[PDB]
Design a protein around this ligand. Structure first.
Ligand code: MYR
Ligand code: MYR
Lengths: 122, 122
């Protein structure tokens, strides 16, 4: 769910996840995808595409189990859809962390999301 | 949609809407309803209940028309659902402004939303 996702992003990036990513760029946070603004935005683009392969569970509301082992997100023993969900979430938290070097605060609150250029198919 | 809603909140409160209200209390922003933490939180509770009873349009996704007339939000006639939605948003934006006087920063990023006491039925 959003809870696990946020917790993962905090754990990987060290950053308040709604603050940094809730409305970032054309792909991070609320809304759908769009032409990505930068690498961070692409992480989110990839994450939303990842969600589309999911059937059987709801990425926003379904909670799942994971742990923190040797500073690594470890997706739990769940079920098939929840496992892949957890893996989508882990992957975006890692990607966001890896692209902290180019995170741009000026994209943090993109209230112009509805006007982002249409995303290409996943 | 979220676009109109965030814009009204900014126009009414003067505050970055996702920043102040995206994760506030047990009721504002992401997630569902819960026992309100304060007056600001209560505004969002009422807003979420307002959303509950709409039919015909999607409150988070569906754009609508409104105007800023003498610093008043004036909902366009739109259609039945979009107008009701517009009035839902207008109401919460006004409510949030009216309660800035007790807004509490300590509630701004409640990552423990899922553990709020269950909200009463709308
Ligand atoms: C209490 C519920 C937790 C709320 C935390 C929300 C933080 C998630 C925002 C980060 C966006 C993730 C990337 C994406 O949009 O796919
Ligand atoms: C692209 C537009 C993004 C706007 C995101 C922020 C929208 C408002 C957040 C707070 C909503 C308060 C009312 C409620 O929670 O029901």
């Amino acid at each position: 769910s959003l809870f696990e996702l946020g917790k993962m992003i905090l754990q990987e990036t060290g950053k308040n996840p709604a603050k940094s990513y809730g409305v970032y760029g054309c792909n991070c946070g609320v809304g759908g995808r769009g032409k990505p603004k930068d690498a961070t935005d692409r992480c989110c683009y990839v994450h939303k595409c990842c969600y589309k392969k999911l059937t059987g569970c709801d990425p926003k509301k379904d909670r799942y189990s994971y742990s923190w082992k040797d500073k690594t997100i470890v997706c739990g023993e769940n079920n098939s859809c929840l496992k892949e969900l957890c893996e989508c979430d882990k992957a975006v938290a890692i990607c966001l962390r890896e692209n902290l070097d180019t995170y741009n605060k000026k994209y943090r609150y993109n209230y112009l999301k509805p006007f982002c250029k249409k995303a290409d198919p996943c």
